Amino acid sequence: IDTDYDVIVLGTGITECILSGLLSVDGKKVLHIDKQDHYGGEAASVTLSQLYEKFKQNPISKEERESKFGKDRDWNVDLIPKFLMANGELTNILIHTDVTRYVDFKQVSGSYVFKQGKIYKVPANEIEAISSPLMGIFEKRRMKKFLEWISSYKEDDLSTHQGLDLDKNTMDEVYYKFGLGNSTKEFIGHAMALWTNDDYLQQPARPSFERILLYCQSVARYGKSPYLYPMYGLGELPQGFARLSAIYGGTYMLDTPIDEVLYKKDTGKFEGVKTKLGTFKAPLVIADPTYFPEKCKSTGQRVIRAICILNHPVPNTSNADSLQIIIPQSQLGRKSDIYVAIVSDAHNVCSKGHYLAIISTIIETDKPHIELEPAFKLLGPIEEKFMGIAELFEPREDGSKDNIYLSRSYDASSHFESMTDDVKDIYFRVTGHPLVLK
Amino acid sequence: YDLLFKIVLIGDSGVGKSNLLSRFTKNEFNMGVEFATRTLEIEGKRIKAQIWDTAGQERYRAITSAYYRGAVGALIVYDSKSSSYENCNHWLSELRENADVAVGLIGNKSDLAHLRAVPTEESKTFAQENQLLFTETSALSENVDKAFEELINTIYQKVPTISL
Ligand SMILES: Nc1nc2c(ncn2[C@@H]2O[C@H](COP(=O)(O)OP(=O)(O)O)[C@@H](O)[C@H]2O)c(=O)[nH]1
Ligand SMILES: [Cl-]
Ligand SMILES: [Cl-]
Ligand SMILES: [Mg+2]
């Protein structure tokens, strides 16, 4: 029945729910609205029948879906594939806010990199580093010396820098210092730093250095891989933070479209929203691009995401219940990498015996389907494909002119680091102070 | 304790769900808590009952699917207000979609019997057919402890994640 709030939030994507949970904890009165009947926004996990609704011409017969896929309640399928870095900022936020209370996690079994037609497990430890057929003895020696520098480098101690300057050296020069061949560069840049093109080579080393170190720290936290994945799918994440918000006094409205955004008479500044439940007012709003299309611009990039259902483990993965596949662009003459994120019934996201393999890349030809062929061929026989194209939006302005703080669309990257960057940026724009975790 | 039953409270806002929680666990009464616990012994086994509350999320149908995750039992709560009673139809459909589970129905605020809307007769009939047990309660009369325990008895017949 309340009508006046400190903050109105629109859309229950992970970005919005984290901010909601943070602001409610801060002691702000938050109203959070979604025009849709479920949580998650553009990055929700959905049922198998919902997949058919969204991506298929007609639904599937009851007996075909029953015999092939079992019960719809067993299916929690990510619309946007992401893992969490084990030492990443999202895990840090989950710990501090204790949203870990609402979500369980398992480790992804490994990461694999594509090279000349075959995939190879990225070594997770020394035993694996020795056995690996990815590189030769001298290649392994040179990279060992490179990674030793990654770990022994200290910012404020110049005697540890081995003559390298993160800001004044490009990553190619960092590579050059250590004698690294092009194939070893590709491994480091794509498999550890997780860049999706080679642009980084001609850029200051600092961002590459940060990403690589994050990789190393994430694998060290628990072992096996840099990655974690939530039980019941990525949709558990926003719902976790939403619950945090509600507990701290946040009010939530699902299935409530925005009839009209209200603006201050002459400034264009946010005033409130009209809904079927009434009019609600706040000095500012946080929203995803779908609520304010005129105030967002296109980044120029479109992302194809193919959800693939399988009856069997991915070939050449030792029956791994989860993994990441990385296909570097130079392996395909492409401009950007192709990712595959694979999870299974071990993660309560599909019925017994199935696997979910989600392939994504940035589209660069007029035939996105054909672009993905290389990745399709890595999976073995595929029960079903669900194809979706998404355009990447970002706000035109920062919100300082109108009090409309918009999030960015979920990007092509394989994890949530860029999402948590958005969160921190938006929090600063909204509150005027940097995010301090309690 | 050797058994942990996650049970959730559902039904319209205003009914008394929060108070039925604080009654059974803390023997208190307000005129909010995330979840409250209570241990019982059944056939020599110590059973912790973890009873989750809605944080007011039911008001505008915003209960997360995550609220029902791994819940092996649930209570639907109506009010004095036939509106909530008719709405008990809704929460049944919500629950069997999101949970797995053993269900029971309760008619709270029986202490205000001088303002009754829709009698006990119908509530029993409503429960008997729909396979879920009934107990007319009052959080202020109190069938509180009986209701929860009766549910816990019933769940007892039914029977590697990483920490951050
Ligand atoms: N007389 C009486 N009042 C009650 C009873 N249960 C709850 N209330 C009152 O109803 C109001 C809201 O109840 P609440 O516990 O928040 O129900 P909820 O919205 O379903 O969680 C409070 O002011 C309570 O005092 C009861 O058994 N008897
Ligand atoms: Cl992450
Ligand atoms: Cl090399
Ligand atoms: Mg309540």
Side-chain angles (χ1 to χ4, degrees), chain A residues 1-56 58-125 127-437, chain B residues 1 3-25 27 29-30 32-41 43-79 81-82 84-148 151-164:
Chain A
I1 209 171
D2 304 332
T3 55
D4 293 83
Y5 295 84
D6 304 316
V7 176
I8 287 161
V9 187
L10 312 179
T12 61
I14 188 51
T15 302
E16 281 71 43
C17 294
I18 287 175
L19 289 161
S20 180
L22 300 176
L23 294 165
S24 293
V25 165
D26 278 359
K28 302 312 164 66
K29 190 192 282 203
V30 179
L31 175 70
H32 196 162
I33 304 169
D34 206 324
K35 68 178 189 294
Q36 304 181 340
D37 68 352
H38 58 278
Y39 284 87
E42 305 299 298
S45 311
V46 305
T47 65
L48 185 51
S49 60
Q50 276 136 52
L51 289 172
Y52 281 89
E53 293 168 32
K54 296 186 212 291
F55 304 114
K56 295 300 192 173
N58 53 289
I60 179 177
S61 87
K62 191 249 281 309
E63 70 199 53
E64 197 186 347
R65 91 112 138 287
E66 208 166 69
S67 293
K68 289 184 165 195
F69 307 115
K71 296 302 192 81
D72 231 358
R73 72 191 58 113
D74 289 357
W75 294 85
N76 303 274
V77 182
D78 299 326
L79 294 174
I80 306 176
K82 300 279 170 187
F83 295 127
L84 293 73
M85 293 297 280
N87 196 238
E89 291 294 288
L90 184 55
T91 61
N92 189 40
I93 294 164
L94 292 159
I95 296 298
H96 276 88
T97 67
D98 212 20
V99 169
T100 52
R101 181 188 319 202
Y102 311 124
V103 194
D104 300 303
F105 294 93
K106 285 181 171 163
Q107 304 183 255
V108 174
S109 318
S111 186
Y112 289 72
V113 59
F114 180 94
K115 189 178 177 68
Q116 282 315 293
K118 312 197 286 165
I119 59 164
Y120 293 84
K121 199 194 178 292
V122 180
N125 54 47
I127 302 158
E128 286 183 343
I130 286 156
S131 72
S132 175
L134 252 170
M135 42 185 72
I137 292 144
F138 282 7
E139 283 181 314
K140 293 181 181 189
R141 282 177 187 193
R142 287 190 294 271
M143 211 205 270
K144 190 148 167 289
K145 200 176 91 75
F146 167 80
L147 293 177
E148 281 178 337
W149 168 80
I150 294 286
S151 74
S152 66
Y153 173 105
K154 302 199 276 275
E155 184 65 40
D156 295 316
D157 187 355
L158 285 139
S159 65
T160 69
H161 291 194
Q162 302 188 213
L164 294 168
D165 186 301
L166 296 190
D167 302 288
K168 277 147 74 37
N169 288 124
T170 70
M171 198 62 187
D172 223 0
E173 294 175 324
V174 166
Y175 284 150
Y176 177 83
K177 183 261 183 294
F178 287 103
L180 306 186
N182 291 345
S183 156
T184 301
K185 302 186 194 189
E186 185 182 81
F187 183 81
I188 295 156
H190 299 259
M192 299 175 92
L194 302 166
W195 288 120
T196 62
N197 51 59
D198 283 334
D199 289 6
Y200 81 96
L201 291 171
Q202 298 313 130
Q203 289 172 329
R206 191 171 292 276
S208 298
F209 179 94
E210 288 169 344
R211 291 170 162 247
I212 298 163
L213 181 61
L214 209 222
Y215 193 94
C216 293
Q217 291 171 164
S218 292
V219 189
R221 259 261 220 177
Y222 309 112
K224 302 173 188 66
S225 89
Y227 302 128
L228 304 164
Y229 186 79
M231 295 304 286
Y232 301 98
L234 297 174
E236 302 306 282
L237 297 158
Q239 299 178 81
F241 286 94
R243 173 87 164 169
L244 174 77
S245 189
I247 286 288
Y248 277 85
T251 309
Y252 273 76
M253 287 162 186
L254 253 50
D255 192 46
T256 305
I258 303 309
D259 288 338
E260 194 181 338
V261 176
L262 303 170
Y263 299 94
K264 287 300 198 204
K265 195 167 95 288
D266 287 306
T267 66
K269 284 164 185 266
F270 185 78
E271 208 200 315
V273 290
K274 297 185 91 291
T275 76
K276 61 166 181 176
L277 302 177
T279 304
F280 312 103
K281 301 179 174 280
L284 65 94
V285 65
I286 307 159
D288 70 58
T290 72
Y291 292 81
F292 291 93
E294 306 315 316
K295 294 178 159 289
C296 298
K297 58 187 196 206
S298 178
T299 69
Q301 308 160 287
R302 288 162 67 239
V303 183
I304 179 140
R305 298 172 173 116
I307 295 155
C308 303
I309 308 169
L310 316 169
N311 279 339
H312 54 87
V314 173
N316 301 296
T317 64
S318 280
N319 308 141
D321 64 21
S322 55
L323 68 141
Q324 152 103 307
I325 293 165
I326 303 159
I327 313 167
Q329 97 284 353
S330 94
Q331 289 298 324
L332 300 184
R334 278 187 63 74
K335 292 172 99 65
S336 62
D337 294 17
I338 300 171
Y339 291 130
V340 192
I342 293 109
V343 287
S344 55
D345 71 33
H347 312 91
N348 297 171
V349 296
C350 59
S351 67
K352 210 251 276 194
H354 292 98
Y355 285 75
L356 296 172
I358 309 172
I359 312 165
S360 60
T361 191
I362 286 163
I363 298 169
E364 62 188 60
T365 83
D366 46 33
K367 263 88 87 57
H369 292 229
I370 295 169
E371 285 180 49
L372 295 187
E373 189 66 41
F376 285 149
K377 289 179 173 160
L378 296 175
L379 302 185
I382 301 161
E383 273 221 281
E384 197 53 78
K385 300 176 194 161
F386 304 86
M387 314 291 261
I389 300 160
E391 187 170 6
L392 301 187
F393 301 100
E394 73 189 321
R396 304 181 171 279
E397 297 182 351
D398 61 1
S400 63
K401 287 156 181 170
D402 56 12
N403 291 319
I404 297 169
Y405 301 87
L406 299 171
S407 59
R408 310 170 69 94
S409 298
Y410 301 118
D411 66 27
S413 73
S414 60
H415 54 63
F416 276 127
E417 280 290 297
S418 54
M419 180 269 158
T420 57
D421 288 8
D422 204 27
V423 170
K424 291 179 165 180
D425 182 41
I426 300 165
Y427 186 89
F428 186 93
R429 284 149 51 196
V430 167
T431 67
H433 305 276
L435 173 60
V436 160
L437 292 171
Chain B
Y1 57 92
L3 296 161
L4 182 41
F5 300 154
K6 182 186 181 179
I7 104 101
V8 298
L9 306 159
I10 58 179
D12 292 7
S13 181
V15 171
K17 297 187 297 304
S18 302
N19 276 295
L20 278 174
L21 183 58
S22 57
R23 257 278 143 188
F24 176 66
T25 58
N27 198 56
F29 195 74
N30 201 309
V33 188
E34 167 107 70
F35 75 93
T37 57
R38 185 169 156 170
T39 322
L40 310 168
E41 198 193 43
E43 286 178 39
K45 285 185 181 66
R46 270 216 176 281
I47 295 164
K48 182 58 98 179
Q50 203 185 54
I51 315 138
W52 299 75
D53 208 5
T54 64
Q57 282 185 307
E58 79 277 24
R59 288 178 282 162
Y60 316 108
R61 289 175 194 191
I63 290 171
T64 61
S65 285
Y67 178 67
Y68 306 90
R69 299 302 180 202
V72 282
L75 289 175
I76 304 166
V77 196
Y78 80 89
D79 181 35
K81 284 283 170 71
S82 79
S84 67
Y85 180 62
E86 192 166 60
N87 288 325
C88 293
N89 286 285
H90 164 66
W91 305 107
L92 268 175
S93 319
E94 295 281 290
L95 171 66
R96 258 97 61 140
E97 182 190 337
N98 298 64
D100 308 348
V101 50
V103 201
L105 179 71
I106 47 194
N108 197 55
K109 302 200 189 174
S110 63
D111 54 300
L112 304 160
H114 60 100
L115 288 160
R116 169 168 283 100
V118 166
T120 312
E121 61 185 67
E122 195 180 354
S123 305
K124 194 84 201 305
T125 315
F126 193 55
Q128 294 295 284
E129 189 176 292
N130 286 303
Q131 289 187 240
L132 90 156
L133 203 64
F134 172 77
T135 316
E136 194 142 329
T137 63
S138 163
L140 201 149
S141 64
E142 297 178 3
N143 278 233
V144 183
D145 283 44
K146 179 173 178 172
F148 278 99
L151 192 91
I152 301 303
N153 279 30
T154 319
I155 305 160
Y156 177 69
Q157 337 290 47
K158 280 282 173 190
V159 202
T161 62
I162 198 166
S163 314
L164 306 196

